[PDB]
Each structure stands twice: as C-alpha cells, then as structure tokens.
Write a protein that binds this ligand. Structure first.
Ligand SMILES: CCCCCCCC/C=C\CCCCCCCC(=O)O
Ligand SMILES: CCCCCCCC/C=C\CCCCCCCC(=O)O
Ligand SMILES: CCCCCCCC/C=C\CCCCCCCC(=O)O
Ligand SMILES: CCCCCCCC/C=C\CCCCCCCC(=O)O
Ligand SMILES: CCCCCCCC/C=C\CCCCCCCC(=O)O
Ligand SMILES: CCCCCCCC/C=C\CCCCCCCC(=O)O
Ligand SMILES: CCCCCCCCCCCCCCCCCCCC
Ligand SMILES: CCCCCCCCCCCCCCCCCCCC
Ligand SMILES: CCCCCCCCCCCCCCCCCCCC
Ligand SMILES: CCCCCCCCCCCCCCCCCCCC
Ligand SMILES: CCCCCCCCCCCCCCCCCCCC
Ligand SMILES: CCCCCCCCCCCCCCCCCCCC
Ligand SMILES: CCCCCCCCCCCCCCCCCCCC
Ligand SMILES: CCCCCCCCCCCCCCCCCCCC
Ligand SMILES: CCCCCCCCCCCCCCCCCCCC
Ligand SMILES: CCCCCCCCCCCCCCCCCCCC
Ligand SMILES: CCCCCCCCCCCCCCCCCCCC
Ligand SMILES: CCCCCCCCCCCCCCCCCCCC
Ligand SMILES: CCCCCCCCCCCCCCCCCCCC
Ligand SMILES: CCCCCCCCCCCCCCCCCCCC
Ligand SMILES: CCCCCCCCCCCCCCCCCCCC
Ligand SMILES: CCCCCCCCCCCCCCCCCCCC
Ligand SMILES: CCCCCCCCCCCCCCCCCCCC
Ligand SMILES: CCCCCCCCCCCCCCCCCCCC
Ligand SMILES: CCCCCCCCCCCCCCCCCCCC
Ligand SMILES: CCCCCCCCCCCCCCCCCCCC
Ligand SMILES: CCCCCCCCCCCCCCCCCCCC
Lengths: 226, 226, 226
C-alpha cells in the first residue's frame, strides 16, 4: 500500500510539473511567468523527493520506528514557495512576507525535530512548538496578509477568502495525520499514513497550484483597465 | 551547572523574543517593523535551539570529546540577521552587505568544521581560517561599512561607533571561549564554557537587539525633518 | 596522485581568490565590485573545500566505494554564483534567473544523491535525472538567457556566444568524468578522477572568472557613451 501511494505521488507531482512547466513556457507576461514558475518548482521538487521515497530512500528506523525524514526536506523547500504563491498574489509587504516565511521555516524545522527525536516525549514537545509556529502563520495570514490583500484588491476579497480557506483547512490536516501516524498515537498503519500524506501533498501542491492560477485570472480580470 | 545555564538561555531568548515580537506588532512604520522583525527572529531561533540544548539534544561525543554541534546551527542562522541589523541601520551597499554575509557564513562554517573535526590539529587549522574570516568582517565593518554609514548619517558617527564597538568586543570573546573550552586548551569545565556562551549569546542577541532599537531611535531623531 | 592534485586545487583557488579579492577592493564602480565579489566567493568557497579534501576530510567509504561527498557541497554553493556571473552580465529577467538557479540546484542535489546512493542502479537513475536538469539549464541558456542578453546588448552577441560556449563545453565534461570515475564505469583510478575534477574546477572557476571579467570589459566598452 505504502509503495503504490508513493508512486501515485511521483505521477501526480510529475503531471503537475509538466502542465505548470508548459504554462511557464507559454506565459503571457512576467507576472504569469513568475506564478507558473513558482508552482512548477513546488511540483518539480515534490516529484524528485517522492521518487526518492518510492525508491526506498530517505527513510530510517529510529529506535525501532520507521521514519521518513526526507519528507521534511520536501516540506522545507516546497512550503515557502506555496507561501510565495500567497504573498505574490496578495502583493504582501516585505516584513509580513519575511514573517510568514520565517514562522513557516520554524514550523517545518521543529516538525522535523519532533519526528526524528528518539525520545518521543521530547518529540511531542517539538510537535506543540511546531503547532504554535503554524498558529503564528494562521494569525499573520487572517490578519496582516488578508488586510493587505483586501486593501490591494478591494473588489476581490472573496478570492483571498477562498485561497486562505483552502490553505488553512488543508495545512491543518498535516498535524492531524502526524498525530494518527507512528509519530503520535499510531492509530493508522504505514500504508494509510502514506496514502493520507500523498493525497494531502497532491492537493496542497497541484490542487493549490491550479487554485493560485485561477485566482490570478480572477484578480487580472477584476483589475482589468476600463 | 551546564543544565541551569542552558535553561537561563531558553528564558532569556524567549523574553527577548516576546518584547521584540510586541515591538514588531506595534511598529509605527515599515523601517521599525523590519528592525523589530529581524531581532524577533534572531531571538526566536536562539530560543528554540537553546531549548534543544537544554533538552539534551544537538550534542555528540566525538572521539571521547562532548561536542555541541547544534550550537553552530544557531550561529549560522542568527549571525547573518545580526549583520542585517548593522547593514539595515547603516543602509549598506549590496556588495559590502553581501561581502559581510559571505565572510560571516565562512567564519561560522569553518568554525563548525574546527569543532567537529576528530583530528584536533585539523580542527585548529580551521580555527585559524575561521579567525581570518572574522578579521575579514572586522576590516569590512571598520572601513567600507563605517564610511558608508558615516556618509549616510554625517551627524550620527557616534551611533555606528557604539554599534561597531559592542559588535567587535562581544564577537571577539567567542573565539577566546572556544580556545578556553574542550575545543582548545580545556582550561574551563563544560559548566563554565556553557555559562560563558549563554551570557555571550543573551548579550549579543537581546543586548545588541535593544542597542539596535536605541540606535534606530537616535538616527530617526537626528534625521527628523525640520 | 590524488593528494598532490587536491593541493594544486587549494593553490589555484587561493590564487584566484586573492586576485578577484584585489579586483573587488579596487573596483571602479558597483557593477565591477559586484562581479569581482561573486568571483572572489566562488574561488574562496572552492579554496576552503579543496583544503578540506586535501586534509583528508569530506570523504566516506560507502559499501566499499570511496566517495568524496563534500565535493557536492562545493558545487551546490559555487555553481549558482557562476550562474549569477551569467545572469549579471546578461541582465537576465527574474523568472529566467530563478529558473536557471532552480534547475542548477536540482542538477547538483540529484547529482549528490546519484553519488551517495549505496544502490548504484538507484544512483544511475539519479544521474539520468541530474543530466535532464542540466539539459533544462542548457535549453534556458541557449534560448531565453541568450535572447534576453542579445536584446540587452545587440552589438555584443559574440560576448555571450563565448560565455555560453565555455560554460556548456566545460560543464558537460563533469558528467563524463562522473561516468569514468568510481561513481560509474570506474575506467580511471582515483588519482586520475581527482586530477580531472581539479583541472575542471580551476578552469570553471578561475578560468571562467577571468572570462567573466574580460566579458564585462567588452560590454562596458561596447556600450560606452558617445
Ligand atoms: C526569515 C525572517 C527573517 C527576518 C528578516 C527580515 C527582513 C530583512 C530585511 C533586510 C534589509 O532590508 O536589509
Ligand atoms: C528561520 C529558520 C528556523 C529555524 C528553526 C529553529 C528551531 C530550532 C529547533 C530545533 C533544533 C535542534 C535540532 C538538533 C537536534 C535533533 C537531532 C537529534 O535529536 O538527533
Ligand atoms: C554571499 C556572497 C556572495 C556574493 C554575491 C554578490 C551579490 C550578487 C548580486 C546578484 C545580481 O545582482 O544579479
Ligand atoms: C558562503 C558560505 C561559506 C561556505 C564555507 C566554505 C568553507 C569550507 C569549509 C569546510 C568544508 C568541509 C566540511 C566537511 C568535513 C567535516 C566533516 C568531518 O570531518 O566529519
Ligand atoms: C529557485 C526557484 C524558485 C522559484 C521562485 C520564483 C521567483 C519568486 C518570486 C517572488 C516574488 O516575486 O514574490
Ligand atoms: C531547488 C532545490 C532542488 C532540490 C532537489 C530536489 C530533488 C530531490 C532529490 C533527492 C532527494 C533524496 C535525498 C535523500 C536520500 C539520499 C540519502 C541516502 O540514500 O542515504
Ligand atoms: C495512479 C495515477 C494517479 C493520478 C493522480 C493525479 C492527480 C493530479 C494530477 C494533475 C493533473
Ligand atoms: C508583526 C508580527 C511579528 C511577529 C511574528 C511572529 C511569528 C512567529 C514565528 C515563530 C514562532
Ligand atoms: C534548520 C533548522 C534546524 C534543524 C536542525 C536539524 C538537523 C538534524 C541533524 C541530524 C543528525 C543527527 C546525528
Ligand atoms: C489536533 C491537532 C491540530 C493542530 C493544531 C494547530 C491548530 C491550527 C488552527 C487552525 C484553525 C483554522 C483557522 C482558524 C480560524 C480563522 C478565522
Ligand atoms: C481532494 C480532497 C482534499 C483533502 C484530502 C486529504 C486527505 C488526508 C486525510 C486527512 C485525515 C485527517
Ligand atoms: C483496501 C484498500 C482500499 C484503499 C483505497 C482508498 C481509496 C483512495 C482514495 C482516493 C481519493 C481521491 C480524491 C478525489 C477528490 C475529488
Ligand atoms: C488519488 C490522489 C488524489 C488527488 C486529489 C486531486 C486534487 C488536485 C486537483 C487538480 C485539478 C486539475
Ligand atoms: C534565570 C533567569 C534568567 C534571566 C535572564 C534575562 C536576560 C535578558 C532578558 C531580556 C529582557
Ligand atoms: C571589497 C572587498 C572584497 C573582498 C572581501 C573579503 C571577505 C573575505 C571572506 C572570506 C574569508
Ligand atoms: C555550509 C558550509 C560547509 C560545511 C559542511 C559541514 C557538513 C558536515 C557534515 C557532517 C557529517 C559527518 C559524517
Ligand atoms: C585569542 C584569539 C582571538 C581571536 C582572533 C581574532 C582577532 C580579531 C580582531 C578583533 C579586534 C577588535 C577590533 C580591531 C580594532 C579596530 C580599529
Ligand atoms: C553583560 C556583559 C557582556 C559580556 C559578558 C560575556 C561573558 C563571557 C566571558 C568571556 C571570557 C573571555
Ligand atoms: C559556584 C557557582 C557560581 C557561579 C555563578 C556565576 C555568576 C553568574 C554571572 C552573572 C552575570 C550577569 C551579567 C550582568 C550584566 C549587567
Ligand atoms: C544572566 C545572563 C546575563 C545576561 C546579560 C544581560 C544583557 C542584556 C541586556 C538587556 C537590556 C534590557
Ligand atoms: C602547483 C601549482 C598549481 C598552479 C595552478 C594555477 C592555476 C590558476 C591560478 C590562477 C592565477
Ligand atoms: C520558462 C520555462 C520554465 C520551466 C523551466 C524548467 C527547468 C527545469 C528544472 C528542473 C529539472
Ligand atoms: C537539498 C536537496 C535534497 C538533498 C538531500 C540530501 C541529504 C542526504 C543526507 C545524508 C544522510 C544519510 C543518513
Ligand atoms: C555522456 C554523458 C553526457 C552528459 C549528458 C548531458 C548532455 C548535455 C548536452 C550539452 C550539449 C552542449 C550544448 C548543446 C548545443 C547547443 C546549441
Ligand atoms: C584548460 C583546459 C580546460 C579543460 C580541461 C578539463 C580536464 C578534464 C578532462 C575531462 C575528460 C572528459
Ligand atoms: C605519471 C603521471 C603524469 C600525470 C601528469 C598529468 C599532466 C597534468 C596536466 C596539466 C594540464 C594543464 C592545462 C593547461 C591549459 C593551458
Ligand atoms: C594545472 C591546473 C590547470 C589549470 C588550468 C588553467 C586555466 C585557468 C585560466 C587562468 C587565466 C589567468
């Protein structure tokens, strides 16, 4: 089960890569080229790292617990690009952008330590720290980021509502899966944990990628010159 | 002794984080927001990494020598932000900024190798290389950086004198502690080495943070419009 | 043989560092300062990492195969700076610059995995992936990069022809050496593999550095105001 869902990961991310790549190549102006290029690299990075997992790499048995540590290398590289999707579309100020990228990096880094810690009590301390880093990003997104975006696009409030709704719901699912998996309560087997992360990853990357494109189109039409 | 001084580290950096965070949240313009945000992240990074050390992590016994390698992860991330404090306040040109960040990264990277090298002769070669990287930064700071800062703020020469004096004195203490510790002559026990680094870290982060804020206020008042 | 050619590496990169450093110090304007500083850091990074290799570091025996993994740390840091040489001189757009840096990072990262993989079949999968990342960069360079450069300097088409010719020929030699070495067919001994990489590295860093300087002079004279 694990094996097939890793390969579905490779196929999904590779298909996302190709179509974002073709978009980037054909891009009508620099704004569209940039957005297509961010999403291409999110999906390209995820493809290669899913290939490593499918080939049996990036995994260690830590005190008897099978642990896919390469997964956090993927997240550390792809999640800031997903935040750049948001800050690009929102035309976010540098301090709030920096704060979002900082908190997110902190979330993933503490997430990594929470995972690879042999002492699972220490791991679970880091989980809580990581959740607080996520909460920091949630606060920044629904406050400073949203208000800046709404100020920049007064007629497109709903666009950023949809973007933030999808981001916040999908990203909250990750720490829930982490709790269900061998990292936490171990309520689901490795096959199921792998399926959950793969579906999450394809949705949060290819799914959110296409939503980011659709959102750019709506903003472009909404701000079209008379 | 080691244990308590690691926890004093956590408390100090966490208190620095909170007050810089509150400053950032309340920041009167983008210049103040940026400065508060840089210092928040210096102290936030240091908090989490001091928590890892206090919890017993980030440490290895290398050929019988207890070695806290995570300490250099902290320095590699926080020291460029401290340099950004200087280059932000000094409105430093991109090449000199880049040169400062480059030399500093080189210092910490060679510092790391100097530490984790099992062969202590090779370690001590890397110490000397790291000292020369520091000397490079000293030269850049007291020459190009200072002259640019003085050119930018002709009436605030003393501000940058105070900033550079505190930076140069505090940062020179680090390689001295390194020589006194198990990395060098082992003239002080692990408890004392830990106390020294903690006091240095709180001073160079929270201390220098507040000096950076005070300096910004002086520059803002000095350049206030008639 | 290996040992001497590592030390020739240290001497070559150190000599390149000094002369680029002296250029940077004496630089006539910010454009020359930036170009000199990029090339200084390419050569400075390479010096320190060649010193580590010469001192016997950064090497592991992976399932009986001696493997110099620190070599890919050098390439991961120095190769984007070499790309920055090109994008600086070409005044390349941000998306194409980003695409070049992204593909190059991907090439070196997959190159690294291709090397350290104990399973050499998996290694050779990663080699092919890495070659496709290189091909991506080749496409970007000879298309978008070249056309932007030619648009920016209509009278200096030959300058960028020379830059791209040297880049493409030299960089293609790396995957050939990789195939000849213990990573591939093992058709050459470790002494010869080391000599090849050292000569390549000095040429692609000091050699290309001086070509980048010469190219800047030609562009400056070609665009000199009447
Ligand atoms: C990651 C977050 C770190 C904080 C960085 C804040 C922005 C730095 C501004 C640099 C500058 O303007 O000179
Ligand atoms: C802006 C970038 C954010 C940086 C994250 C800072 C948070 C620090 C978190 C933990 C660092 C400790 C990691 C080293 C110990 C884990 C290894 C182990 O236990 O084997
Ligand atoms: C770290 C230091 C590395 C040197 C980088 C110098 C600045 C790069 C300028 C990039 C550009 O202008 O295109
Ligand atoms: C601009 C970034 C600066 C990069 C720093 C370059 C200096 C290179 C220093 C040393 C690299 C060697 C590290 C690998 C060997 C150490 C590991 C070991 O001995 O076990
Ligand atoms: C490395 C490549 C990654 C893709 C990044 C594309 C450029 C990001 C633009 C950021 C922005 O304009 O806000
Ligand atoms: C823009 C940055 C590019 C990032 C590169 C992405 C490609 C991913 C490649 C492979 C990741 C797998 C590495 C971990 C497994 C190797 C370690 C081992 O086998 O012992
Ligand atoms: C087994 C095949 C899996 C297909 C998943 C595809 C999901 C996203 C594809 C992007 C278009
Ligand atoms: C303007 C607000 C500045 C503080 C941002 C807080 C982000 C926290 C990230 C680490 C936890
Ligand atoms: C980048 C933020 C800090 C994360 C540090 C994680 C590094 C862990 C290294 C594992 C090695 C164990 C021996
Ligand atoms: C069971 C573990 C759950 C993870 C803890 C992190 C909580 C994050 C909160 C996200 C909630 C969604 C957005 C909040 C409402 C915004 C208005
Ligand atoms: C397409 C649907 C997007 C969400 C699916 C996520 C699957 C992971 C399940 C999480 C369990 C809490
Ligand atoms: C006995 C094993 C059965 C497990 C198969 C689970 C089914 C996979 C779920 C697919 C989800 C697709 C999401 C589509 C969104 C529209
Ligand atoms: C079997 C994996 C399920 C992936 C969920 C699909 C969501 C991505 C949306 C793509 C839109 C085209
Ligand atoms: C045991 C308590 C240690 C307190 C140290 C605090 C030093 C700096 C605090 C920032 C205000
Ligand atoms: C303008 C001066 C350029 C050279 C800077 C030298 C910095 C050395 C850093 C590595 C040692
Ligand atoms: C980033 C500058 C170069 C520093 C390289 C240090 C990496 C050392 C890795 C330790 C692993 C030992 C086995
Ligand atoms: C005993 C080891 C000391 C570390 C060697 C590094 C020397 C750095 C020099 C710093 C001196 C302070 C500033 C110099 C005066 C500027 C005018
Ligand atoms: C507050 C005082 C700042 C300096 C204290 C640093 C303590 C470390 C001692 C260094 C020994 C040479
Ligand atoms: C027997 C153990 C005694 C060791 C305690 C050492 C005292 C701690 C030093 C505190 C330094 C505070 C700096 C204040 C700066 C004003
Ligand atoms: C016991 C640790 C000593 C920390 C030194 C205090 C220096 C920080 C200055 C904070 C100013 C408010
Ligand atoms: C054994 C000496 C090797 C010298 C090689 C030098 C090649 C480039 C030097 C830059 C000038
Ligand atoms: C404008 C073209 C955008 C796509 C660039 C493709 C680069 C591929 C790098 C990873 C392989
Ligand atoms: C940065 C792109 C991804 C490359 C990951 C390579 C890390 C390999 C770590 C080796 C540790 C083996 C145990
Ligand atoms: C034997 C392995 C060779 C490595 C495969 C990578 C091929 C790269 C192609 C480079 C060719 C040079 C430039 C192409 C012509 C441009 C016009
Ligand atoms: C000076 C000549 C530049 C090219 C020399 C490269 C040597 C490596 C040999 C590669 C073998 C295919
Ligand atoms: C018996 C061992 C002999 C091996 C020596 C190989 C000769 C070294 C090649 C030097 C290449 C210099 C390139 C100069 C370019 C002009
Ligand atoms: C023995 C190593 C051969 C290095 C090749 C020399 C090419 C560098 C060109 C430097 C120009 C001055």
């Amino acid at each position: 089960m694990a094996q097939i869902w890793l390969w579905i990961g490779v196929i999904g991310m590779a298909l996302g890569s190709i179509f974002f790549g073709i978009g980037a190549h054909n891009a009508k102006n620099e704004r569209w080229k940039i957005l297509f290029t961010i999403n291409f690299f999110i999906c390209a990075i995820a493809t290669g790292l899913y290939l490593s997992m499918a080939l049996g790499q990036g995994r260690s048995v830590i005190a008897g617990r099978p642990t896919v540590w390469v997964r956090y290398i993927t997240w550390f590289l792809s999640t800031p690009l997903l935040i750049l999707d948001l800050t690009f579309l929102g035309k976010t100020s540098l301090p709030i952008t920096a704060s979002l990228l900082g908190a997110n990096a902190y979330m993933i880094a503490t997430g990594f330590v929470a995972t690879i810690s042999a002492d699972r009590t220490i791991g679970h301390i880091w989980y809580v720290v990581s959740c607080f880093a996520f909460l920091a990003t949630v606060y920044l997104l629904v406050n400073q980021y949203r208000k800046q975006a709404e100020r920049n696009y007064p007629q497109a409030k709903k666009v950023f509502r949809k973007l933030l709704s999808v981001h916040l719901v999908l990203w909250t699912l990750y720490p829930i899966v982490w709790l269900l998996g061998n990292t936490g309560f171990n309520a689901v087997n490795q096959g199921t944990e792998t399926m959950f992360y793969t579906i999450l990853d394809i949705t949060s990357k290819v799914g959110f990628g296409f939503l980011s494109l659709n959102s750019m189109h709506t903003l472009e039409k909404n701000t079209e010159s008379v």
